Amino acid sequence: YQYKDILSVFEDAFVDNFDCKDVQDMPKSILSKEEIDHIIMSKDAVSGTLRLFWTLLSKQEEMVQKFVEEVLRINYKFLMSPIKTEQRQPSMMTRMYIEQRDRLYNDNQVFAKYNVSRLQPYLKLRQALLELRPAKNVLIDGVLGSGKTWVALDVCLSYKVQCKMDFKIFWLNLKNCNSPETVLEMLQKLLYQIDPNWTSRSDHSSNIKLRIHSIQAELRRLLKSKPYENCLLVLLNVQNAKAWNAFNLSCKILLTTRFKQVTDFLSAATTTHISLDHHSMTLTPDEVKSLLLKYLDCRPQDLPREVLTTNPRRLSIIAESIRAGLATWDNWKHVNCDKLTTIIESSLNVLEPAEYRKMFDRLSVFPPSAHIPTILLSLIWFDVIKSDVMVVVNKLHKYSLVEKQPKESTISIPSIYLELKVKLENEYALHRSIVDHYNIPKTFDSDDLIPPYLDQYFYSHIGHHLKNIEHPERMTLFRMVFLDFRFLEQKIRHDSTAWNASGSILNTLQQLKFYKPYICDNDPKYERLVNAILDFLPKIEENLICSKYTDLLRIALMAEDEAIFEEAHKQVQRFDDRVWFTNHGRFHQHRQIINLGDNEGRHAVYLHNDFCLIALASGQILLTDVSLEGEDTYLLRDESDSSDILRMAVFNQQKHLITLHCNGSVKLWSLWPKQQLVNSVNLKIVAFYLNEDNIQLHVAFINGDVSILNWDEQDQEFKLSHVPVLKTMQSGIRCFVQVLKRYYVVCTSNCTLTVWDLTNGSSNTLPLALDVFTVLLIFKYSVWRLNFLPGLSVSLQSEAVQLPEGSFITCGKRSTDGRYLLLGTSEGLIVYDLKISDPVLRSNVSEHIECVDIYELFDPVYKYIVLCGAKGKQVVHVHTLRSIAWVHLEPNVYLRSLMDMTRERTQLLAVDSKERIHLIKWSTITPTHAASNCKINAISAFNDEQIFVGYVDGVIIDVIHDTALPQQFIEEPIDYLKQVSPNILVASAHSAQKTVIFQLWPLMMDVSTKYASLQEGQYIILFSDHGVCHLDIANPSAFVKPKDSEEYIVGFDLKNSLLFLAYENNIIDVFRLIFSCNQLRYEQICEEEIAQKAKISYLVATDDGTMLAMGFENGTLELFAVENRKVQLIYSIEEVHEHCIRQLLFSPCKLLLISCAEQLCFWNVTHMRNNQTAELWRNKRGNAIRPELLACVKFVGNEARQFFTDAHFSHFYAIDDEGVYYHLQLLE
């Protein structure tokens, strides 16, 4: 390491000890006399020491090492010992600070190149950073280009700031962020700066605002950690206050701005103000000559006297850049309107004026700050040129105004003048110049997938060119929409560099937004259905962010799925291509939204046994079945009273309901068998509290008197208790609760809190709802927690729970488990955690909520059910919580897996989490034993009339006949159930290693079977973990026990009387089955060992048995053929899947191979062979990159265990682990 970097470390006590006023014997070579006198002339110790430090860092080590050895040696040896050792030891803090400083220097090259330190702004802003608190923020403002970046970077380079920020400072340039979705990109950048870890499965979609809120919450959770507790985050060139609201994180933030409106919005009380426009806060003439001499390197420069010092010289640099070319002379002339950009007009007419003026002015057509291809730049200039394109490009770079990124041969437009003066008269020929622009790709030819198309420009800013054409040409073939454009645009323009992964969704919505302006293409009017699809494309695009930019998939298949009306566009679009398939015309995944007629639900509550009670606007009660499978919906209406419902509570093991209306009446309803008026047991009734230990009711009148009522089971009625009426004398009570069976907490309409001691009756002085679990107070605008502690004076700890701006609370409810609680607001639902006081979740809908309810659930997967009703809507939304996140058929049941396919291929059978068998050709069958809470473990069907099922306790049911087979053989879970012939059945327990064969005897083997087969109607072949066994039906006593092989069988298949077997050590044995009249014999054909390292996961052989293929646990897929008693590798494909291959299947025509894993892949066998039903798959070709990969469909779930095909290989049935269940049909 270098001494200069470590010298900046020892700075504080360096200021305390070193003087620089007592070392004027300083060897003159190290410090020149003029500059050392300048340092000594400084007034205070801190400023002089800082100037000395800067001057020392300016020089090289050939004087730094002399500063070490000499100078201080005469008197400052006491300051040697740390640094005299710190050069060697290099402590961990020193190393971390140096590493961060090097990273910051490498990030900004110009800072290292042409730096200059402004003492006054640097010190002034450093003091604010030192004093700053983890919630406040310091704002620095000034005219555009007043060098706020100078001072910001300079201050952050100081060691004291880094030490106080714990070496955790994150920059963020907030430029071009006036859209609600670029802020999401900036948040992703900040997260990547934090840590490259994010479970992207949280596809919120809907409005992007919800996703930005979710990522804000995630990063807020991630930042409040001890290493990240104090951290500087810097906002650069912030645009509008909206970005600030999207970027306030309760962190040590600081923003630099230039718009005055941001300063107006910013509250100076909570934010310190730093101004660069102050007359004292400006470049001094000494600073003027320092900046001028930074890299001009000339002795006499006094001619630039009275140049724009005000200028942060951001202007000067302009002037200096001219100096590298045009003389200082005529720049004293350039002072005319020096403050205004007329100087920018100069140095351009001074540029060679033959043709370069108009030649450069041609660059106004391009969008600002865009990477311009040089090839297109050739034609945009083809009017004259009269030179070589690269020659004029080189001269353009030479003067000031080209950076010329050569990696992809692209011109870059600078961004300090070309935003201005490019208007002029816009020369002429602008529209025909853009005509040439759209001509160079001749965007009317599209034949197959992606044609020649420039990757960067023509996928990014082509819309700008398309905008400035004739209107008949504007609408006719705008391309864009959806054919192939956005898929390859998303993959190629991917922004995977730092703030995203391979492929994004952003900057295409920002092209489809600002297409919210361009539906003006023909307006809605003509192709108004295209206006509809233009609106819907955002939603479907956010619906499939994941599973699309993770692998080699194309947009077309994932389009051809789904619903709504885009399919009408696909059917027209996709009639000029080969292969292609889906037509997934079925959906059996969950339910939501419950109809409740023309009335609007005021309140909602869930009930046991899957029911819901809705309190309606009309004053009635609607009891409904949530499964949408029952047939009973009851309407409980009070014929005498129609007052609206204000409150209710279900009690008595949810068998009775207590309700309270506006008219001062409280009633009791019986739900599972009589409306009782408890008030009869002119004073109106305001509020109540039901508490259960003895079930008890407390009630408050209008005058404040509180009464106490006891439940009666024998009559199921509320009687008056003998406790005397406490006179609260608090009229206008709005709510009241009992705490610890001793105290009363009362809140009135005037936000007044009172506490009453039931033992003595004394009153203590200290709104929407009050709950006890500490007391939760819910107001319209605020939420309060009141922790209670017992004592002579009751001690209450009040904590505010944060809520979002511009919104108010309507109603709330706490979970039964007391961990989370739900708040309803005009924007939607907020799921809030009590133990962390952070908003965990937000409802997917931006709507005015009028009722909230939560229901704890008993399942390892689903935990809570959420109900919410909307004002002005005739629906009520049902949301389910999974361990917590939104899951987006009863809302508490899901299909697990355990498929079954009939031999004739006419019916498919599935099982759900509630042991119900679903038949799809859709009907539901419930077996009798499901009431015994026995988990469903295996299912097997042969025809539509024989369906058998095995449970976890060794129990066999015939589903259709509801008959149980003899229960005296297997008591363990049944891991396998399948019948091979209409009169035989096999069942096995793997844990007990037991098998039973039923004749539809039964026969018992001490073997565990993973697969069973019948041969010649005589021999039953069983595959075990230890070997293969064969049984004769005619002679069951001749069972052949397996040889005790130490090797487990991992893959196998029996085809064409040839037995393939794979062991864990990557060895295949292939045998030929020879059938004699009295004995089954195995002759060994081959033994061979695989070169692939990974374990074999599945094996499959073709019908003729000539070929085979296996997949491995790492996702590799291998194909071999079997010739000359040898197995030779035919083809290898890697990165097929990231999980182990779950199934492999060969078509009878031998042209196709299906792989079932995290994604379903179709592989072409012919192209597979040539590079060492049939009419449907002939001449089908795949992607150019992977010619053997015909198609691939990604399951929304993590994996799929099994898949089935029909006889014609035209339909494919699949079920992933999440219960979503796919029908994949070939496009006929």
Tab-separated table of C-alpha atoms in Angstrom, residues 113 154 171 203 205 318 365 422 447 479 660 750 752 780-781 810 884 921 1004 1039 1049 1132 1174 1208 1221:
chain	number	residue	atom	x	y	z
A	113	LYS	CA	-8.280	13.736	-13.199
A	154	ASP	CA	-14.875	15.771	-2.000
A	171	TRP	CA	-24.611	7.146	-4.414
A	203	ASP	CA	-44.929	-10.687	-8.910
A	205	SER	CA	-48.134	-6.677	-11.027
A	318	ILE	CA	-15.961	24.668	-21.439
A	365	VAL	CA	-32.845	14.543	-34.820
A	422	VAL	CA	-30.484	22.180	-31.148
A	447	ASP	CA	-40.354	-13.827	-42.165
A	479	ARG	CA	-44.779	-2.621	-35.901
A	660	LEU	CA	-75.536	-3.039	17.236
A	750	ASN	CA	-63.479	14.145	21.193
A	752	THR	CA	-60.485	11.984	25.052
A	780	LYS	CA	-58.929	7.801	11.355
A	781	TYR	CA	-55.394	9.166	10.875
A	810	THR	CA	-61.706	3.395	8.148
A	884	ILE	CA	-46.457	-14.210	4.706
A	921	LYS	CA	-62.632	-35.250	-18.740
A	1004	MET	CA	-47.248	-61.295	0.798
A	1039	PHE	CA	-41.068	-66.404	-6.014
A	1049	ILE	CA	-31.434	-48.988	-8.503
A	1132	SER	CA	-25.300	-34.533	-24.822
A	1174	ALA	CA	-45.101	-38.696	-37.350
A	1208	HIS	CA	-51.651	-39.352	-30.720
A	1221	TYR	CA	-52.807	-27.666	-13.829
